[PDB]
Amino acid sequence: GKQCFVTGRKASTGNRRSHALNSTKRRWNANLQKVRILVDGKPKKVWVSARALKSGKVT
Amino acid sequence: PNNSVLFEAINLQRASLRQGTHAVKNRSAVSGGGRKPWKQKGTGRARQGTIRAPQWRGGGIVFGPTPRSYAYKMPKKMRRLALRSALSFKVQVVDAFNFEAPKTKEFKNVLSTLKKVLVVTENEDVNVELSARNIPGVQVTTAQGLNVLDITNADSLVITEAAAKKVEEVL
Amino acid sequence: PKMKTHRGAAKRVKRTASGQLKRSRAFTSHLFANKSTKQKRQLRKARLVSKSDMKRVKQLLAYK
Amino acid sequence: KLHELKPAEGSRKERNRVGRGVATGNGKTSGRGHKGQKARSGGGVRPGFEGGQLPLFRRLPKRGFTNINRKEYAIVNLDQLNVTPALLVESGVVKNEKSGIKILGNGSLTVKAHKFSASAAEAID
RNA sequence: AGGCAUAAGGGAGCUUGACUGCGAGACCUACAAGUCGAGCAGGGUCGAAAGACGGACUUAGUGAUCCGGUGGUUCCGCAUG
RNA sequence: GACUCGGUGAAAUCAUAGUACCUGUGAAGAUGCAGGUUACCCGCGACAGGACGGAAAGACCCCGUGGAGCUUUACUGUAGCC
RNA sequence: GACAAUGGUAGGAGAGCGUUCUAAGGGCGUUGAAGCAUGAUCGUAAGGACAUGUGGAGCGCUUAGAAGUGAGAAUGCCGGUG
RNA sequence: GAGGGUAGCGGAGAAAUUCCAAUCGAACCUGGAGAUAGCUGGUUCUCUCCGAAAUAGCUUUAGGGCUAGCCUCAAGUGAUGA
RNA sequence: AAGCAGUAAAUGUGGAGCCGUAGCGAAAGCGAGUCUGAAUAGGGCGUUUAGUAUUUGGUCGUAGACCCGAAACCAGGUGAU
RNA sequence: GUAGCGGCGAGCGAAACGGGAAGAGCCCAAACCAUGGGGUUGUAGGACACUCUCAAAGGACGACAUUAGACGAAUCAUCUGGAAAGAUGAAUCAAAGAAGGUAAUAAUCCUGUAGUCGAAAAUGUUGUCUCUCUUGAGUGGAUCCUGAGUACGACGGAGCACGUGAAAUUCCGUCGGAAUCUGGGAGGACCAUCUCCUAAGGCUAAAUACUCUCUAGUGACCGAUAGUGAACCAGUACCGUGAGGGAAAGGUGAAAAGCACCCCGGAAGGGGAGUGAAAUAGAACCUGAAACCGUGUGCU
């Protein structure tokens, strides 16, 4: 569905553990956020992860 | 001769010479099933679990054939002693064969002037094996390929002057 | 399938040069004010697993 | 001879075959006695189970550790000697130098080796 | 409950054997456990000495392993220190 | 409807049966054992005392270190919510 | 020869019979194999022959080897029939 | 009446644990799967020799199990058995 | 042993590896002794001095493991005629 | 079944050395130069200086094999028979005595086998020559490059034989966040010293797993309740709304020679008469057991 347009940031899936170590499946979403960027075909708006918009991509 | 070892050599060889390609289908393999036929409790019929169980017909073999090997081994020294005992009981020898062309009548004459014969030659003469593979009761081989089943199946041994020496060198 | 050893009994007992085993001694971990100096010193040694226990457990240590 | 074969007297026996009649001795119950957890296909309790009472090898304290650098040697006595480590291998004495050939002093009588017992270094001279 | 007036009961002086390493042999015992023990070596206390002393007149007052803590130590410490 | 006649024609049940009563005995309620008493061989219509009659591997009771559903301030968790 | 022993459930040990196939050897068979039916037969048992009918083309026997190796019980499965 | 919609860790319920294809305190079908069953039932030929137990201890144990007691086969010691 | 040769065969070759002739200790490490110990003092374990390879049978272990038989659980679908 | 991992329980359980099958290594980004060229690495390589000279991808080119086939040795006679391949005689072939069929049991009767030969054409592969490609190599070094929100840290997880542990080596999400050859990393926490390598770009055949599928074959594998559920027009009758479940069903004879004709009968079905070696082998057709149903009769 959603993933970083620039990087490949997906969501993972791990276990929410406990104190009794009773694990249950959880996910690990990526810090994805909409923003307008100059995809050189035209200015669009897309999902970008806050990591990937750390100093290296122009809005 | 050592009969206690020669028996095991023969039995070992006839065991090793089996395929073992024989199978059968148990509950897991027979088609269908996976449905209890009736309810187990109110019918009046016996309680059953599937129509492909052993007591039925058409389903299920409890044990039986499986594709499995039959050969086994035994020590090098016992192998060599069984071969020595077989030759020892044969003892209990001609010049070289001369066959330009494979001509079975020539070989039949050669066997008559001298019917379970085992004609043992040197490395391989490919006009004596051919001259002799059609006669019923005659088996030909070489000093590197002396079986124990071959030997003990034979009523006679016809080994050349060279094969006698090569087997005296081997064993 | 090789028969597996009992990896919790290999941490406890060893085999001697007669085919018999050399276990440790129980009652030697705490509550030492509740034992005689004889009973504390008599337990410091080691003993052999009895024949009954060579009955229950002898294939659990067949490689050891 | 291939039509009169005879295995050595005492080698072979016919297997025991249970559950076939009551005149063999192992027919009805087939050597299992009457009802119970051990007269059921699926075996009894696992070996070493002991029924609920805490088993032996969980009721005794653990003991020691294992050294990583354990140097076990090839033990030769002075009866084997009635001399490089290689010649001692190529004679048929040391079929494996585990760490090195150590010479001991049991028996009676030059030697290159990696260690020596006291009795050995005495009785070689 | 069994013994005790050898006192095992009472009083007084002196001290720390309420020791360290052990242990022939035996009782009990399904196992794990439990009980007794002459004698031997190191060090001593009492006594003038022989000697006695490894708790209490005897038998209850206790809880496997795993794991954690602390004190030492000769051991190990994943190329070497 | 049943009953008799012509036509057609099942079913549950069923160890083999030449299948009596009584007083006993017996796994303590016998057609079948003991001791007695009674009964010539075969049907047909009818009744419902016994065959511990027949159907339904007792829905009761208890036992599975058996399941399932429900409850809660039982244990450990969890969607969610702050 | 003489003496001694020989009830048996759970269970332990030994010796055997029989079935299908395989190797070797040696045989039977359209002048009639296997099978089936009958029989008044031999063995301590599992069982083995023989004869006659029926049948129409394959089977024993010795010695070893290998097993899908023996059925009266599973409210067993399928078919037939009461 | 016709045409449609809601589906099982679910749906509908004027509420009965009521309905969801003659089945519902959680449908049916196929797979994991030959689940597991310390429980019932069954377990196929002959002969020869020997021949028990229903007890102790511990047990989440009490119709189960483990060690010991009682049986059997082999080797040995060797008079130690009554 | 795998491998290579060999008729889906024996069999030849293949010494990596395994078992054994040495044990004791947790270990360093000693070694016909060793560990505990101040001390063979005593004591534990050793010094039996034949093992090994293949296979017949008995039995056990991991695989459904003597056969039949649940109530149930999970996953993926088919169902509102 | 070792080291270890484990309510240290049930259990899980490596790897390197050693022996073997197979076996090749390479193209980039960066510096620099004029989209192109140059350059690809650890006993440091490249640039820069001299000197000294899979790997790029389209195409034709004769042999082998695969898809129909041809040849293919050598026997006659009596007894039984319904019928000879059998039994009894004499004989030949064998690089062919595998197998099947033929009125019975065949090396010589047929189809075959041993062996040799065969391709209009299509196709796959091996081969040469064509074809496209193509600058190789040492020495010195001031200096310029060698993969950055990357390595790594903290937190929460996953994975390593390894359960958060003293957890090294690898990944994921979230924040912070490095150096550049005396640089970086690893050697089971960690530091020092040594030893070995050079991350953060990419591509690679073989040794290996398996079987729809074609051809050739073997079996101490089954032989019609077996073997596939299906030897038979079978995933079919049938069952279900549906997903889906699912059977029973083989044999005349060597050859149909499969009963012309007559009689009873409405036909079916019979009894003769013929075919046949056999008809109680007459298509409900090889044998033809038992339960079960009958008719007759010796003893009661």
- Write the CATH number for D101: 3.100.10.10
B7, B149, B152: residue with CB nearest D6? B7
* CA-based max dimension of chain B: 89
Strand G contact at CB of residue B75, distance < 7 A: no
Counting the structural domains of chain B, the total is 1
Domain span holding position A21 = 1-59
CB distance C57 to D48 below 8 Å: yes
> Measured in whole angstroms, how far is the alpha carbon of residue D43 from the centre of its chain?
27
Q: Is the C-alpha dihedral spanning B24, B29, B35, B36 positive or negative? A: positive
> What are the CB-based long-range contacts (under 8 Å, 24+) for B74-82?
B74/B8, B74/B9, B74/B12, B78/B5, B78/B8, B78/B9, B79/B9, B80/B171, B81/B2, B81/B5, B82/B2, B82/B5, B82/B6, B82/B8, B82/B9, B82/B148
Q: For chain A, how many helices (H) and strands (E)?
A: 0, 4
Strand partners, B120: B141, B159
CA distance D5 to chain B (A): 7
Strand partners, A25: A15
- CB of C11 less than 8 A from some CB of D: yes
Pairing type for strands A42-49 and B117-121 reads: unpaired
Single-letter code of the amino acid located at B161: E
- In this structure, the number of other CB atoms found within 10 A of the CB of residue C6 comes to 20
How far apart CA A47 and CA A37 sit, in angstroms, is 10
- In this structure, the number of other CB atoms found within 10 A of the CB of residue D81 comes to 16
Asked if B3 and D6 come within 8 Å (Cβ–Cβ), the reply is yes
The SS3 assignment for A19 reads coil
Element (H, E) at A44: strand A42-49
For B142-158, letters b (16+ CB in 10 Å) and e give bbeebbbbbbbebeebb
Instruction: Give me the helices (H) in chain B, please.
Output: 3-16, 76-91, 104-113, 129-132, 149-153, 161-170
How far apart CA B97 and CA B123 sit, in angstroms, is 13
CB distance B171 to B80 below 8 Å: yes
Counting the structural domains of chain A, the total is 1
How far apart CA D97 and CA D93 sit, in angstroms, is 10
Domain span holding position B22 = 1-171
The SS3 assignment for B78 reads helix
How far apart CA A48 and CA A45 sit, in angstroms, is 9
Structural domain boundaries in chain C: 1-64
CB distance B1 to B81 below 8 Å: no
CB distance D100 to D114 below 8 Å: yes
CA dihedral D88, D92, D94, D96 (to 10 degrees): 120
Cβ contacts of D30 within 8 Å, gap of 6 or more: D18, D19
Q: CA-based angle B6:B132:B79, to the nearest 5?
A: 20
Element (H, E) at B141: strand B139-142
Q: CA-based angle A40:A42:A45, to the nearest 5?
A: 105
The SS3 assignment for B16 reads helix
Residues 36-95 of B with CB under 7 A from strand J: 51-52, 57-58, 61, 65, 70
Query: First vs last Cα of chain C: how many Å apart?
Result: 17
Strand F contact at CB of residue B47, distance < 7 A: yes
Strand partners, A32: A49
Cβ contacts of D117 within 8 Å, gap of 6 or more: D102, D103, D104, D105
Single-letter code of the amino acid located at B49: G
DSSP D16: P
CA atoms within 13 A on the CB side of D82: 7
Domain span holding position D122 = 74-125
Q: Which token pair is A27?
A: 């996910």
CB distance D102 to D115 below 8 Å: yes
